[PDB]
Enzyme design. Structure first.
Site, PDB file in Angstrom:
ATOM      1  CD  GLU A  15      -2.878  -1.257   2.358  1.00  0.00           C
ATOM      2  OE1 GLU A  15      -2.432  -1.840   3.372  1.00  0.00           O
ATOM      3  OE2 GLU A  15      -4.004  -0.720   2.336  1.00  0.00           O
ATOM      4  CB  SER A 145      -5.476  -1.314  -0.629  1.00  0.00           C
ATOM      5  OG  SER A 145      -5.180  -0.157   0.147  1.00  0.00           O
ATOM      6  CE1 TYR A 212      -6.941   3.843  -1.582  1.00  0.00           C
ATOM      7  CE2 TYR A 212      -6.311   1.761  -2.590  1.00  0.00           C
ATOM      8  CZ  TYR A 212      -6.640   2.502  -1.472  1.00  0.00           C
ATOM      9  OH  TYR A 212      -6.667   1.910  -0.236  1.00  0.00           O
ATOM     10  NE  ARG A 251     -13.149   2.864   5.345  1.00  0.00           N
ATOM     11  CZ  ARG A 251     -11.996   2.354   4.942  1.00  0.00           C
ATOM     12  NH1 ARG A 251     -10.868   3.043   5.022  1.00  0.00           N
ATOM     13  NH2 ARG A 251     -11.971   1.114   4.458  1.00  0.00           N
ATOM     14  CG  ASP A 253     -14.052  -1.545   5.318  1.00  0.00           C
ATOM     15  OD1 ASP A 253     -14.349  -0.330   5.369  1.00  0.00           O
ATOM     16  OD2 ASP A 253     -12.926  -1.962   4.976  1.00  0.00           O
ATOM     17  CD  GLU A 266     -10.428  -4.087   6.517  1.00  0.00           C
ATOM     18  OE1 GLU A 266      -9.375  -4.360   7.123  1.00  0.00           O
ATOM     19  OE2 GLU A 266     -10.478  -3.356   5.512  1.00  0.00           O
ATOM     20  CG  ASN A 268      -9.200  -0.706   7.348  1.00  0.00           C
ATOM     21  OD1 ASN A 268      -8.412  -1.573   6.977  1.00  0.00           O
ATOM     22  ND2 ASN A 268     -10.458  -0.659   6.929  1.00  0.00           N
ATOM     23  N   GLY A 272      -7.297   5.467   4.784  1.00  0.00           N
ATOM     24  CA  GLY A 272      -6.766   6.382   3.792  1.00  0.00           C
ATOM     25  C   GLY A 272      -7.137   7.821   4.093  1.00  0.00           C
TER      26      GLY A 272
HETATM   27  N1  LIG Z   1     -16.906 -11.777   3.160  1.00  0.00           N
HETATM   28  C1  LIG Z   1     -17.038 -10.879   2.154  1.00  0.00           C
HETATM   29  N2  LIG Z   1     -18.179 -10.777   1.438  1.00  0.00           N
HETATM   30  C2  LIG Z   1     -18.315  -9.889   0.436  1.00  0.00           C
HETATM   31  N3  LIG Z   1     -17.348  -9.039   0.050  1.00  0.00           N
HETATM   32  C3  LIG Z   1     -16.155  -9.037   0.685  1.00  0.00           C
HETATM   33  C4  LIG Z   1     -15.930  -9.974   1.793  1.00  0.00           C
HETATM   34  N4  LIG Z   1     -14.674  -9.757   2.238  1.00  0.00           N
HETATM   35  C5  LIG Z   1     -14.145  -8.763   1.477  1.00  0.00           C
HETATM   36  N5  LIG Z   1     -15.031  -8.338   0.556  1.00  0.00           N
HETATM   37  C6  LIG Z   1     -14.807  -7.274  -0.450  1.00  0.00           C
HETATM   38  O1  LIG Z   1     -13.399  -7.034  -0.548  1.00  0.00           O
HETATM   39  C7  LIG Z   1     -13.086  -5.711  -0.072  1.00  0.00           C
HETATM   40  C8  LIG Z   1     -11.832  -5.731   0.792  1.00  0.00           C
HETATM   41  O2  LIG Z   1     -12.099  -6.574   1.905  1.00  0.00           O
HETATM   42  P1  LIG Z   1     -11.630  -6.192   3.395  1.00  0.00           P
HETATM   43  O3  LIG Z   1     -12.034  -7.350   4.272  1.00  0.00           O
HETATM   44  O4  LIG Z   1     -12.184  -4.825   3.710  1.00  0.00           O
HETATM   45  O5  LIG Z   1     -10.014  -6.156   3.343  1.00  0.00           O
HETATM   46  P2  LIG Z   1      -9.033  -4.900   3.017  1.00  0.00           P
HETATM   47  O6  LIG Z   1      -8.258  -4.748   4.306  1.00  0.00           O
HETATM   48  O7  LIG Z   1      -8.175  -5.357   1.862  1.00  0.00           O
HETATM   49  O8  LIG Z   1      -9.916  -3.720   2.705  1.00  0.00           O
HETATM   50  C9  LIG Z   1     -14.302  -5.259   0.714  1.00  0.00           C
HETATM   51  O9  LIG Z   1     -14.453  -3.837   0.677  1.00  0.00           O
HETATM   52  C10 LIG Z   1     -15.441  -5.985   0.030  1.00  0.00           C
HETATM   53  O10 LIG Z   1     -15.861  -5.264  -1.134  1.00  0.00           O
HETATM   54  N1  LIG Z   2      -5.836  -0.003   4.269  1.00  0.00           N
HETATM   55  C1  LIG Z   2      -6.534   0.810   3.223  1.00  0.00           C
HETATM   56  C2  LIG Z   2      -5.641   2.069   2.859  1.00  0.00           C
HETATM   57  O1  LIG Z   2      -6.240   3.211   3.720  1.00  0.00           O
HETATM   58  N2  LIG Z   2      -7.493   2.783   4.047  1.00  0.00           N
HETATM   59  C3  LIG Z   2      -7.650   1.360   3.729  1.00  0.00           C
HETATM   60  O2  LIG Z   2      -8.820   0.659   4.019  1.00  0.00           O
HETATM   61  P1  LIG Z   2      -9.012  -0.843   3.382  1.00  0.00           P
HETATM   62  O3  LIG Z   2      -8.713  -0.773   1.905  1.00  0.00           O
HETATM   63  O4  LIG Z   2      -8.080  -1.790   4.101  1.00  0.00           O
HETATM   64  O5  LIG Z   2     -10.467  -1.187   3.633  1.00  0.00           O
HETATM   65  K   LIG Z   3      -7.368  -4.120   9.087  1.00  0.00           K
HETATM   66 MG   LIG Z   4      -8.283  -3.120   5.546  1.00  0.00          MG
HETATM   67 MG   LIG Z   5     -11.508  -2.917   3.826  1.00  0.00          MG
END
Ligand SMILES: Nc1ncnc2c1ncn2[C@@H]1O[C@H](COP(=O)(O)OP(=O)(O)O)[C@@H](O)[C@H]1O
Ligand SMILES: N[C@@H]1CON=C1OP(=O)(O)O
Ligand SMILES: [K+]
Ligand SMILES: [Mg+2]
Ligand SMILES: [Mg+2]
Ligand SMILES: Nc1ncnc2c1ncn2[C@@H]1O[C@H](COP(=O)(O)OP(=O)(O)O)[C@@H](O)[C@H]1O
Ligand SMILES: N[C@@H]1CON=C1OP(=O)(O)O
Ligand SMILES: [K+]
Ligand SMILES: [Mg+2]
Ligand SMILES: [Mg+2]
Lengths: 305, 321
Positions: A15, A145, A212, A251, A253, A266, A268, A272
């Site tokens: 990242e 990301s 991005y 933040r 998700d 997750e 964070n 960003g």
């Molecule tokens: N269990 C899930 N079901 C549906 N979509 C997912 C799932 N896990 C991840 N995603 C998709 O992948 C993206 C990144 O996943 P995330 O768990 O937030 O990891 P990162 O730390 O890479 O953001 C999410 O924003 C979502 O769009």
């Molecule tokens: N880790 C990335 C970069 O800054 N914010 C983020 O959120 P994410 O993509 O992990 O959901």
């Molecule tokens: K995380």
């Molecule tokens: Mg993340």
């Molecule tokens: Mg995420």
């Protein structure tokens, strides 16, 4: 009065490019508020006049504009702890926990926060078929990301996805895919910010390239959600933030399924801070401009350390 | 043969225990034919004169007081003979990660989770390991009576060696116990007291060692004086338990070790109530290696001598890092 801030950015994680964009925004914003800012690329050092286009003595706080890897997983936080330096974001334990998606999801469940079923690789064809079903998500345990993440639609797609995720870390997660909408909740000093929705169109996931590039996806703050669902997403994000003992800001998700149920993916600790980024948009919807946001994060980090 | 740097001492309340552990480990590894550097993390690499005086110091009846701690505050592997504070909570581990050094025991996340007793207990329950009800201060006297009742245990969230811990039998004792525990860290736990027997399980390289029992006599808890004054309490390895209970303690300890992603070795503490139920208190990633310590006795009961135990912990660290 005004601060002397050293903005740490860049690093050596996947990242890095996102981190450079965040660092550039934060440096400009803090300078706009009249603070003295030192720009430090942690992969090279203190930037000179041209590169921006000792001295760290007397720095009030290190603003961590890093994402992923040792800058976000607690390693750098412990380095700064041992040097007695103040920094922004969460501490060593909290940062390490939030980066380990497996550990974090166990704590989500302990806190009463819904999260999708998962297994850590390796998993047999029987375990996957009985406990997860298809499609499923393969992701590195400690990335960001959307780096290294695949949607697996059949058993034959599983091994290449696990090998891909394994190029980016030591642990690999297999998680049930939640169909529906994409929602995210920022927190700033124990207060939830307005909920945001990312409109993915026909896409299954929110991937690196759409995260991005300007205008690649529409992002709506406050999200067009029934008020009780948005309030629940904020309630759950605060529970996550407190559960993992986060500090300053975060933040979280979520996926919102077609039945109105929220699933926490997750959290964070160093989200960003770029132009297109989600946390600044949530702050702006709450009435907090970007410069004020950066300054408040600085002062929260100072108060903690 | 290896070149080992034994790090010990530090500036935590367990400094005296750490000096005693480091002294044993340094002696044992040198007997096994290894080159050993002694490093007090409070100063630096020690010369022979400062080594001789430091390591001869025995654990006292009380931990080093705050004023004393205020004044204090080609290697193949770093043996971490530290206890508590930054030596055990992941901070030093991350320092060593960043420097690319090999070290013994668990990594920085695993060490941080095991020192945070609150978080560890949440993960115990997630892994199916029973643990006692608890609250984190501040908790209203109203909440305490409703959830825990008396007797209860007040302990710092991130201490060891029973530092800062009190049994609270009545309301009037509660506030002074919380104030005491707050002198040893930022977070304070209130936990339901489990009457019964004192049981501990060592783990070495993903295998459980023979269960030990600490016979407390009339004491309700295993305190700092009785943990390290020689002959203060009788410790039985293998414990005189019904076989099904000892085997369950070992199963649970392995679940704990794996759940928190520990490495190398650990030692998990349980209370065994009069109905035969095991209640997990904590796991320790850098357990004591002093002459009165529990992990070496479990290792010996499995047929593993102390020098061999030290060498095996070294090689597990090298292989991991
Ligand atoms: N269990 C899930 N079901 C549906 N979509 C997912 C799932 N896990 C991840 N995603 C998709 O992948 C993206 C990144 O996943 P995330 O768990 O937030 O990891 P990162 O730390 O890479 O953001 C999410 O924003 C979502 O769009
Ligand atoms: N880790 C990335 C970069 O800054 N914010 C983020 O959120 P994410 O993509 O992990 O959901
Ligand atoms: K995380
Ligand atoms: Mg993340
Ligand atoms: Mg995420
Ligand atoms: N909930 C409890 N019930 C009964 N005894 C306890 C409880 N918690 C702690 N103790 C006693 O206090 C001692 C130390 O507690 P422990 O949780 O192991 O902290 P430390 O990390 O200081 O060893 C234990 O060995 C036990 O004797
Ligand atoms: N933490 C101490 C010192 O080494 N081993 C110990 O176990 P504990 O007293 O924490 O149960
Ligand atoms: K512990
Ligand atoms: Mg302990
Ligand atoms: Mg103990």
């Amino acid at each position: 009065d005004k601060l002397k801030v050293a903005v740490l950015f860049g690093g050596s994680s996947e990242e890095r490019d996102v981190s450079i964009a965040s660092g550039a925004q934060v440096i400009q914003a803090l300078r706009s508020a009249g603070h003295q800012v030192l720009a430090v690329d942690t992969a090279s050092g203190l930037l000179g006049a041209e590169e921006e286009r000792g001295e760290l003595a007397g720095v009030d706080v290190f603003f961590l504009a890093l994402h992923g890897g040792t800058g976000e997983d607690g390693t750098l936080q412990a380095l700064l702890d041992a040097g007695g330096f103040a920094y922004t974001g969460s501490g060593h334990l909290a940062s390490a926990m939030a980066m380990d998606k497996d550990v974090a999801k166990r704590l989500f469940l302990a806190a009463g926060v819904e999260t999708a079923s998962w297994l850590m690789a390796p998993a047999s064809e029987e375990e996957v078929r009985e406990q997860l079903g298809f499609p499923l998500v393969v992701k590195p345990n400690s990335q960001g990301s959307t780096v290294g993440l695949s949607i697996v639609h059949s058993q034959a797609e599983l091994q290449p996805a696990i090998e891909l995720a394994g190029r980016y870390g030591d642990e690999v997660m297999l998680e049930r895919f939640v169909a529906g909408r994409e929602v995210t909740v920022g927190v700033l000093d124990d207060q939830a910010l307005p909920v945001g929705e990312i409109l993915l169109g026909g896409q299954e996931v929110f991937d690196y390239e759409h995260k991005y590039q300007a205008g690649a996806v529409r992002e709506v703050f406050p999200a067009d959600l029934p008020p009780a669902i948005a309030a629940e997403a904020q309630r759950l994000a605060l529970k996550v933030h407190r559960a993992l003992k986060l500090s300053g800001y975060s933040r979280t998700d979520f996926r919102l399924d077609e039945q109105g149920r929220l699933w926490c993916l997750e959290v964070n600790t160093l989200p960003g801070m770029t132009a297109t980024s989600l946390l600044p948009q949530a702050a702006a919807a709450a009435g907090i401009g970007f410069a004020e946001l950066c300054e408040r994060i600085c002062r929260l980090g100072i108060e903690r350390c």
